[PDB]
Amino acid sequence: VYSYTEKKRIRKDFGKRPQVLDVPYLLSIQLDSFQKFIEQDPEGQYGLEAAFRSVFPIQSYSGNSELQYVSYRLGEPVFDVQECQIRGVTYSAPLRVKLRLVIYEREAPEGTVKDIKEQEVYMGEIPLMTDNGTFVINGTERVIVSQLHRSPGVFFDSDKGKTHSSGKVLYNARIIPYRGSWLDFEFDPKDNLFVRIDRRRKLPATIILRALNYTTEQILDLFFEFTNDLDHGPYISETLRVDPTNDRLSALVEIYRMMRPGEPPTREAAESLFENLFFSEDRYDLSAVGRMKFNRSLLREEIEGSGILSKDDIIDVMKKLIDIRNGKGEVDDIDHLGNRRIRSVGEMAENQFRVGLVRVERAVKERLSLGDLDTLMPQDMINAKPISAAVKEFFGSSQLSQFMVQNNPLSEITHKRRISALGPGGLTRERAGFEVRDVHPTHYGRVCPIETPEGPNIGLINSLSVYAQTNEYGFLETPYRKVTDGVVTDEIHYLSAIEEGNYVIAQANSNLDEEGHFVEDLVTCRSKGESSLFSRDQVDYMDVSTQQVVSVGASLIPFLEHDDANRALMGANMQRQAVPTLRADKPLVGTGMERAVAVDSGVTAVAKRGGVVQYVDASRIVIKVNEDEMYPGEAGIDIYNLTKYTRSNQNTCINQMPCVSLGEPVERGDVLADGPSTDLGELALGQNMRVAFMPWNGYNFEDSILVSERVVQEDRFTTIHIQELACVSRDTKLGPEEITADIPNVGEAALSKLDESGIVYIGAEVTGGDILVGKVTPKGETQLTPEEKLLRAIFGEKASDVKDSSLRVPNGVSGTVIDVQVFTRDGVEKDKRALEIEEMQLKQAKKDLSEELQILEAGLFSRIRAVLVAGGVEAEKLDKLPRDRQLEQLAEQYDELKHEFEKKLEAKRRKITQGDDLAPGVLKIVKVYLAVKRRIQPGDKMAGRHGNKGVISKINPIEDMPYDENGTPVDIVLNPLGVPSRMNIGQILETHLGMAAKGIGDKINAMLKQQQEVAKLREFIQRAYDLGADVRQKVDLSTFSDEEVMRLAENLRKGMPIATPVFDGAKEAEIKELLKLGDLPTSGQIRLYDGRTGEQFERPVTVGYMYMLKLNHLVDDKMHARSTGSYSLVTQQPLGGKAQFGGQRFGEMEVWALEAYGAAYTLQEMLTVKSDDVNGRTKMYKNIVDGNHQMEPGMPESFNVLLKEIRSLGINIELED
Amino acid sequence: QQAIRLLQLSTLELQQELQQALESNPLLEQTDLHDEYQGETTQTLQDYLMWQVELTPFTDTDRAIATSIVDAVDDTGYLTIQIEDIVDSIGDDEIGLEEVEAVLKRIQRFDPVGVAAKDLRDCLLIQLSQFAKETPWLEEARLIISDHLDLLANHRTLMRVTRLKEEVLKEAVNLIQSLDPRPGQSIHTSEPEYVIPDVLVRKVSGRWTVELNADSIPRLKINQQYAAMADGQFIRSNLQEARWLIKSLESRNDTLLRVSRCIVEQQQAFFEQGEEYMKPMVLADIAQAVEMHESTISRVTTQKYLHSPRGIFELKYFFSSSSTAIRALVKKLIAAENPAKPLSDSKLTSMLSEQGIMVARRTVAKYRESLSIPPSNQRK
Amino acid sequence: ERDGLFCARIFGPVKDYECLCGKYKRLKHRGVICEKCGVEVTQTKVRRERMGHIELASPTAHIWFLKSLPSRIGLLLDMPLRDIERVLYFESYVVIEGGMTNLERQQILTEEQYLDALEEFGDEFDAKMGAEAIQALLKSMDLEQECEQLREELNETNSETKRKKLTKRIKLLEAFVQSGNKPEWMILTVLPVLPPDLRPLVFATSDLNDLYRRVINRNNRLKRLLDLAAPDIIVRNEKRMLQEAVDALLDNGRRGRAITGSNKRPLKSLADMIKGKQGRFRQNLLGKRVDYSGRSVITVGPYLRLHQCGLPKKMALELFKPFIYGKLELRGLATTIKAAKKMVEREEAVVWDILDEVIREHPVLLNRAPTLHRLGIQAFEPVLIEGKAIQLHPLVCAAYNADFDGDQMAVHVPLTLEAQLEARALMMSTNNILSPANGEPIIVPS
Ligand SMILES: [Mg+2]
Ligand SMILES: [Zn+2]
């Protein structure tokens, strides 16, 4: 049954519940949505067709110049994803838009003089998504986080309590359109109905209806039958008394004086203004969501309608405000997911593109109004920039478009899956209170209750769910199983936020045996907003899986239900910070979702098809495709090029390791190789090791961690950092700057490690102040005089009349140069190095394009060999004759294919040379990279998945480490007292099971260390996957158990990968029952001996294998020291941080701590001589070296600045006495 | 004459003139007004040398002498003043002209070594004093530059004068070449001065777009809240003058665009390959292409600069007041590429016609013959 | 460009003791200004000191006093807020020096009322608007007669409400008189210009000089518009905009909140250069950044005595570097300073022992990121430790409230001798064993 990956190594599973609906695609919310954006849809479905059709046909005023839109297309990408990622251009497609210009006839029944329907008008290029759910704008993969805003519709709020100090609350209605101005109704203690456009101001309600041409007789008619204070409020008529306006014209004039105050009103200006707010089809919109939630919230029958407001809508919802106000309910909170709408890259892309289309329409109506007869065609009145100025303004710079977090392969997935209430259209972090921050019962199965950021924004982000899906309109869907009567059907229904509220849904964990009937007398269910035991036959639906409530970062926590919620948060959040290791160890205790993670992201290497691998190297992988999957034409093979040692947004290293041996069958949809932090398809965020909880003499205090020297020796937690140091200039008014090739003022050593071209050689020992690229620059026509001739004679150098502009290695930084890129602005050559990169890519492409030759030429060759035999058979003479010596058709295809080789290869070569494209005045750019291996060392951050942080205190030798009976050293010594406080007990189980999971391995290795027969290991492995009674094992022996299962041993001799589903995971007697297998005590604790003594530690000691995560907080990046650096100019002060060059900010609270103590000269020197004072710092420095410790303080310079800043006003500030 | 003065001023000078003119009449540019923090850091140059004088004791009286020297230090690192001229600056009779040499040498000896030395041989000689370090070849080396024998190296003429042994002396001269002549002037962050482009030129694929213009062009809007239409006729007369102004301005940009198209087309050979070797177009030749008067095209040609892929140019330099260059082009082209298929004579003439250089199929042959290379004999 | 927001004549030379023309370069000739290009050869630091002035064609109100809670333009005139705001916006006329005709001295009118008042009283009647009106109104109004009028009136009326506002206002007025400021000065004839180096360019005019540039520009237009004989509507509205621009330049965010090019954030005004990040607290009050300092992660000190703590070697070499220089040249290990730093850059093995000498009895200062009680900063004795991480004593760990889960600590060097004494005396560990909150032990094992 198992995939061709599990043929190598399989992960055992713990627990009961069968999986009815398997884990869906994790990149859905991105890929599917942007797919729904750019598509050819022959109808109003959202996308380019949507904004395009709605803004079109653009027509002039009476000119009959109407510009019609037909269809569109996206030309093939100018550059592929790999090439565009190296250069830094945008990965995009040209938008070819069919437009039709039909000129009508002068005063006729729609005649046509001429029709110019001009072929594709080119408007920009638009960014294309990858299969990764990412975009490339410049050189880097970035993600656009889906957002969450207030669903368009009608809002009913209250603002009870503190409004004005009466506790009388308020009833305030509201309207939230998708596009156009807001609407509000605010009630005051005076009880009068107040209507407000946007947030602007307060106006009596009569100014709206009377402006709609409603006299007084038709006002009190609609809202009254009746003066009653307990049922029917006389609120409209009580508002009509403060009414200034008696009619339409008056109300419109007052409105025009409201929206735009401080200008003389008129009639025609006010009519257009008010008609352009909630009425006109251009300015205001609802669309499909607005009228939908509008109607349903108004209890209307119709579920659809116009995207504009009418008098009946306004008066309707107004009546709803009065109904909710007096005695009738009920309030609608903003927390429910029915009032929350999710937006994806597709929808927002359509909105921005629409803005571009309206801004260009404004310019279209003009040139179409003032133009002549047939001359101007599409491409005249329509420009490019009005579009890319929108779409680029979104994709390039937006609060919703943030750089992908590429360090952790889990971080990309948990990034592309997210929710943000902040950003455009949603509430910010400076306003929205604790309400929207908290969790709502509707978040169940949709929004992850645990994984959320901790900080200024809590609950403003949250996450998705494993099985969650995007709803049709704006909402979220949750998977549920249809239960009709007592039979639980396998149909998976999806209920929205408001839908699920009214049904009665059971829980994913409910015991049903036999054919799946509920055994219990009353199962637990959630009816409406609550939970309790319900009747046996009253179950409408039941949750699909127990993981559907949580998210990927949550589900990946082993024994989640064991840990406290807070430490679960901290743990899962820390997990996203884990840095890739040098060797990826699969987790001994996983959730089984690791494969669903590593594969769901591009960090791994998937398979378009399958069949035996042809050529497996550390660089490329070549597969021979089988026939059933392969398409008839061109035949072909599967060529894969693995990215080797490349940079990342976190300064980490991304690299691919081929996992296939050679000459092996593979199945489609399987992993050919392993990227960073991915072990044979399983996601490995780090490594695990032997842990023991004991006090060690105090190096384990609090979260401090003691690590054996064996760990830093074996080079496991080591990481590889890559940094990008780039240099470009030239183009000076005095002439261009040349890159090296000569660099006066330096001796032989600097030029030794630079190539003849002047670029650094590939590879080097580079640290401190070395020269990566030589960079010069002119000053010019300095008058020679007799002296400079002597100067130019004896040295003469370049001739060196010129300065030294060089890029040098930053001080205090080091590494090794690996890769160098150059981009030479078109029109300017480079001597050698650039030609070497161009030629290098040219050969890498040429030997690849020969594969489609030698494979196809040999096949067609053998085909000639077959046909000529029936035609004059000679087999041996066929072997004898040279290779160059129906004949029509075959001889034809030979030549056609060869010529195709020529044109394709030449196209690739020119593509290599041409695009460097850079900024104006930028001549030559060189991106140099430096790679270093940063190991582990005291102070580095190390933590578990369970919410236990840590910092390595000391690195102890292999001796002092407490050891067992067999002398095995413990890898990490941790504190016992952390667990009973932090209330995370999962790290107690993940250790215990680990001791079991490792133990079996330690036995398997031993049993393979004795090289027994195939049969004994077969039986033992049978027992290993059997364990406690039940489920759901599906044990071994299915395939061949000799040659087929032999590899399952070698992968088990390290440890025994085990899957512990979230709430379906292991249990006590399960852990003990697996510990019985190899040899282990139930207590999970053994005897230890101090390596510094040799005696025994009293009491047992809990030991096992726990999974450790190395975040990127590493000390080497943090630690800083400043004695005397550069200061600030305006106010002479130290610089921008711990980060260079400055020094720590000594705050006002620190000044308070110094004020508490009697320390006086301490604070004085602190804010005077140390930093602020201009003269005191130098006059002090001339002292410190002399050996006289004293100060001549003077006055701080920034006070002297404050004096001038106040003196810039009309204020005078002096210094007296 | 308002339009003619309008066109040919520098793009920077024009906008300056309009800004004054913009104040006088109510017209408004695009203001980018939508009605609803550090650019600075320290640097040390001679300030580094002043770090010396504060910590190193000169007492009080000599420190002022040393402070008077650092001002005279050029960016190149050598004194502008004469050693007796700084003596004039101190205005004291206790300097003796001997004491100034005492302090001048001491500030020379702080790194950069060699700094602040008159005549450059000092710098080389006083480089050597600290550099001496007892060894190796400097004893002979210090003789050459000190004896005034620094006529060399102009070229073994030293051997007659120096009498040292021949070829081994180059192991001194080689050691002399390792001295920095003039520390320490180093690159500041000055871009440096960048000439704002008038017009623009570059090539989109297989085409040349001269479309220009940089953002130098002012965008003027004549509409304001004064649309209301002795008093009233003033605003009509000024609005009339301002409506003519935008028209004359729009024509300037329209002319620059046109003139640029025709000056690049005529000269493309220079533009396509290298520099110079420009066919000498005449103002009249471009003046014949389009209706513009030669006086108007000379004026617009004067101060309006041009951006090119290689260099930036005044557009006046395009004007002016053969066999060898084409030969090098032929050699460069045929020597370049030709990996398998040689470049045929027909292909060369095609390539050169495409780029704008005019050569006959027969003249390319004679040029290739004078180069001594046989056509097409070479192959894979 | 001369006579711009950045100029040598208006402010100072770009290069030390150098001209803009180049005739006067060396420091020989100092006090002399110039023969040709107006500059005075002087230190370049005077370019961060000297100020310029802009002459306004029309008077302008100072928005700081108008928008203050006890509005200093309005309350001084005993005039309400909404009214005087209507006067300066050119949205209505105000009466000044009512005389004997009909109206009051301070009264407010409208258009038809203004012309109606002109048709009957053509002369001996004055009403205007704009900043000029509040100017002349404030100037003509004097406090000498109001002292006696007010005081006598206080004797006249028998109610507290009658004389309460009277004594309040009269005391405010006479204190105003003693101050030395006359009311005529809240209408600015001239404007000050901040020195160029206190509003430094990025070459993109910014934030500031953007605002200044607006006020300059729009004002120059008015200076030419008055001599060009333009009607009342044009010069009226451009005077309004002059007031607006001076408003934004002085204190933005009061009304208009103009926001700079590329948007969206409102440009910072001169008050924002005082009201600061959270305030001017950033620099003067909170002492900003400090030299001789640094941070790094904190680990356990279990082998340390209560009076000592661990410090990185490579960090300590930088922290004490100015001491190590002198101690090196004091032993003769290095000739001069240049060779001394040249040695400490090479990290020659002889200098680490010198460091061991100057760091032995010389205390340092630790501290956490949050500071609450005075014990949040405790001085220990440095112990050279190989590594990039700092080590803290576990007993005082309960003071900082420092978890070892990845917090960082700041170090400080008490340079001056008195500070070296105050660090070991009152700032040491042993000297605070008892929390200032309660006399109970703060060292208690955790
Ligand atoms: Mg903590
Ligand atoms: Zn001068």
PDB file of N, CA and C and ligand atoms in Angstrom, chain C residues 18-24 33-39, ligand 2:
ATOM      1  N   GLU C  18      37.191  77.694   4.317  1.00  0.00           N
ATOM      2  CA  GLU C  18      37.264  77.771   2.869  1.00  0.00           C
ATOM      3  C   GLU C  18      36.135  78.649   2.349  1.00  0.00           C
ATOM      4  N   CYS C  19      36.375  79.280   1.209  1.00  0.00           N
ATOM      5  CA  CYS C  19      35.354  80.116   0.607  1.00  0.00           C
ATOM      6  C   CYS C  19      34.476  79.281  -0.320  1.00  0.00           C
ATOM      7  N   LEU C  20      33.425  79.914  -0.841  1.00  0.00           N
ATOM      8  CA  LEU C  20      32.710  79.337  -1.970  1.00  0.00           C
ATOM      9  C   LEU C  20      33.390  79.687  -3.287  1.00  0.00           C
ATOM     10  N   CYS C  21      34.045  80.852  -3.355  1.00  0.00           N
ATOM     11  CA  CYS C  21      34.771  81.234  -4.563  1.00  0.00           C
ATOM     12  C   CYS C  21      36.135  80.557  -4.637  1.00  0.00           C
ATOM     13  N   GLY C  22      36.838  80.463  -3.509  1.00  0.00           N
ATOM     14  CA  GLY C  22      38.151  79.849  -3.461  1.00  0.00           C
ATOM     15  C   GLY C  22      39.315  80.809  -3.331  1.00  0.00           C
ATOM     16  N   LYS C  23      39.064  82.115  -3.217  1.00  0.00           N
ATOM     17  CA  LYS C  23      40.159  83.060  -3.016  1.00  0.00           C
ATOM     18  C   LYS C  23      40.778  82.902  -1.634  1.00  0.00           C
ATOM     19  N   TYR C  24      39.957  82.623  -0.625  1.00  0.00           N
ATOM     20  CA  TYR C  24      40.403  82.527   0.762  1.00  0.00           C
ATOM     21  C   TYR C  24      40.222  81.089   1.232  1.00  0.00           C
ATOM     22  N   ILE C  33      35.658  88.561   5.422  1.00  0.00           N
ATOM     23  CA  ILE C  33      34.509  87.861   4.865  1.00  0.00           C
ATOM     24  C   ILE C  33      34.840  87.408   3.450  1.00  0.00           C
ATOM     25  N   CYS C  34      34.748  88.309   2.474  1.00  0.00           N
ATOM     26  CA  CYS C  34      35.137  87.958   1.113  1.00  0.00           C
ATOM     27  C   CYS C  34      35.317  89.206   0.265  1.00  0.00           C
ATOM     28  N   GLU C  35      36.027  89.025  -0.852  1.00  0.00           N
ATOM     29  CA  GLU C  35      35.994  90.008  -1.926  1.00  0.00           C
ATOM     30  C   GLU C  35      34.810  89.788  -2.869  1.00  0.00           C
ATOM     31  N   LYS C  36      34.496  88.530  -3.195  1.00  0.00           N
ATOM     32  CA  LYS C  36      33.553  88.262  -4.279  1.00  0.00           C
ATOM     33  C   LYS C  36      32.304  87.514  -3.827  1.00  0.00           C
ATOM     34  N   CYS C  37      32.397  86.205  -3.588  1.00  0.00           N
ATOM     35  CA  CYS C  37      31.224  85.432  -3.192  1.00  0.00           C
ATOM     36  C   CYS C  37      30.970  85.652  -1.707  1.00  0.00           C
ATOM     37  N   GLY C  38      29.779  86.130  -1.361  1.00  0.00           N
ATOM     38  CA  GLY C  38      29.603  86.471   0.033  1.00  0.00           C
ATOM     39  C   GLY C  38      29.659  85.248   0.920  1.00  0.00           C
ATOM     40  N   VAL C  39      30.716  85.188   1.731  1.00  0.00           N
ATOM     41  CA  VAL C  39      30.909  84.167   2.758  1.00  0.00           C
ATOM     42  C   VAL C  39      31.880  84.803   3.737  1.00  0.00           C
TER      43      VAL C  39
HETATM   44 ZN    ZN D   2      34.783  84.370  -1.812  1.00  0.00          ZN
END
